[PDB]
């Protein structure tokens, strides 16, 4: 599937980029495509948890 | 309870400090060149 990476992270809002190269941005209250709903976003440790239980973080190659 | 009032004194100075930190906003700059 399309794998998102954290292209930007602040408290409140988050910006993500698909593995194809697409663009998206979300907050904690939003519906995330392919992952359900946004559970928790933390600027500390760079992790986003979804209602599908899946976690999106930085590129390990680009951190 | 003098520790109460000195704590309020220093944090009120800090609060006024952040007021003068936050109440100003600088403007734009439009630059044109041929």
């Amino acid at each position: 599937r399309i794998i998102y990476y954290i292209q930007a992270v602040i408290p409140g809002r988050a910006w993500l980029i698909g593995s194809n190269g697409s663009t998206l941005t979300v907050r904690e209250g939003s519906k995330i495509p392919g992952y359900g709903m946004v559970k928790l976003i933390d600027s500390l440790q760079g992790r986003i948890l979804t209602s599908s239980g899946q976690v999106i973080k930085f590129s390990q190659e680009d951190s | 309870q003098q520790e109460i009032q000195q704590r309020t004194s220093d944090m009120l100075t800090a609060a006024t400090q952040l007021v003068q930190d936050w109440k100003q906003v600088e403007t734009q700059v439009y630059t044109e060149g041929t």
Partner: protein, 154 residues
């Protein structure tokens, strides 16, 4: 003459009260202190470059550029063929957050992040484009974009 021998002893101990070993000790103390000063807590961001294809669709989202304080990033702006499109003018908000040197007839921008974490916006009018391109620049992350190339649609 033991009086003059003790005189030489005490004049030595007041003329050079500091030991050479203590001199080297305090020199290492100086070096350790300034290394702790110049040290940055946390890890420094990863230096990298990117080449992005800008989508100018009205329904789309504007591009987002990571930054970091105290470093200069070069952003170049070329067409979809990659030919070097020059830059006509720009309008920048928050002057105290982002230092900028602009060569007036070039195609590349040098941007230095003056402030630490507060983010900014920038609009740029190109040469033949009726519509300007607006981008968001966000400092303070674990990735510093050293050079971003921008392939525009047009």
């Amino acid at each position: 003459e033991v009086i003059d021998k003790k005189a030489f002893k005490d004049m030595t101990r007041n003329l050079y009260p500091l030991n050479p070993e203590q001199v080297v000790k305090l020199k290492q103390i100086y070096e350790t202190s300034e290394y702790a000063k110049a040290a940055t807590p946390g890890t420094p961001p990863k230096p990298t470059a990117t080449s992005q294809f800008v989508n100018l669709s009205p329904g789309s989202t504007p591009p987002v550029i990571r930054l970091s304080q105290g470093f200069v990033s070069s952003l170049v702006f070329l067409d979809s063929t990659g030919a070097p499109w020059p830059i006509a003018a720009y309008d920048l908000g928050d002057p105290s957050s982002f230092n900028i040197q602009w060569d007036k007839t070039s195609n590349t921008l040098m941007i230095q992040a003056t402030k630490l974490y507060n983010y900014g916006n920038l609009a740029v009018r190109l040469r033949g484009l009726n519509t300007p391109v607006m981008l968001t620049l966000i400092p303070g992350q674990k990735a510093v974009d050293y050079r971003v190339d921008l392939r525009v649609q047009g």
